[PDB]
């Protein structure tokens, strides 16, 4: 799984970082929408935040 993909300079008409929060959504913006990133992998599953785990001790 990639945690971040590689992304480079941008000069577009397509701006993912401008939104309208009045709508009630949290738009899924990522580091790679606003800086230049390199690939990295997650190495993690989110196992210990499962509700079974959270309420299970």
Partner 1 sequence: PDTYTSAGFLSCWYQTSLILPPETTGQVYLLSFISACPDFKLRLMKDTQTISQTVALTE
Partner 2 sequence: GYSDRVQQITLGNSTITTQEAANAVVCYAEWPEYLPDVDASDVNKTSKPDTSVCRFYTLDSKTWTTGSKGWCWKLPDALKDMGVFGQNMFFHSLGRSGYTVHVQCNATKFHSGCLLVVVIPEHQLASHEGGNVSVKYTFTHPGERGIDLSSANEVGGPVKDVLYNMNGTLLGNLLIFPHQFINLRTNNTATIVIPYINSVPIDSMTRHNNVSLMVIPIAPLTVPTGATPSLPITVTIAPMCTEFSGIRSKSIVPQ
Partner 3 sequence: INYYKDAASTSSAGQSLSMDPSKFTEPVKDLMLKGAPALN
Residues at the interface with partner 1 (CB under 8 A): 3-4, 21, 26, 28-31, 42, 44, 46, 48-49, 53-54, 57
Contact partner, 1, from partner 3, partner 2, partner 1, none, Cβ < 5-8 Å per class: none
Whole-number Å distance between alpha carbons of 40 and 38: 7
Pick the binder of partner 3 from 14, 38, 41, 43 (CB under 8 A): 14
Whole-number Å distance between alpha carbons of 39 and 47: 23
Tokens of 33: 């929408």
Residue pair 8/36 in contact (Cβ under 8 Å)? The answer is yes
Residues found near partner 3 in the complex (CB under 8 A): 14-16, 18-20, 23-29, 33, 45-47, 50-53, 56
């Amino acid at each position: 799984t990639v945690a971040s993909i590689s992304s480079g300079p941008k000069h577009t008409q397509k701006v993912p970082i401008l939104t309208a929060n009045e709508t009630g959504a949290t738009m899924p913006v990522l580091p790679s929408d606003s800086i230049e990133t390199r690939t990295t992998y997650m190495h993690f599953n989110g196992s210990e935040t499962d509700v079974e785990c959270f309420l299970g001790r």
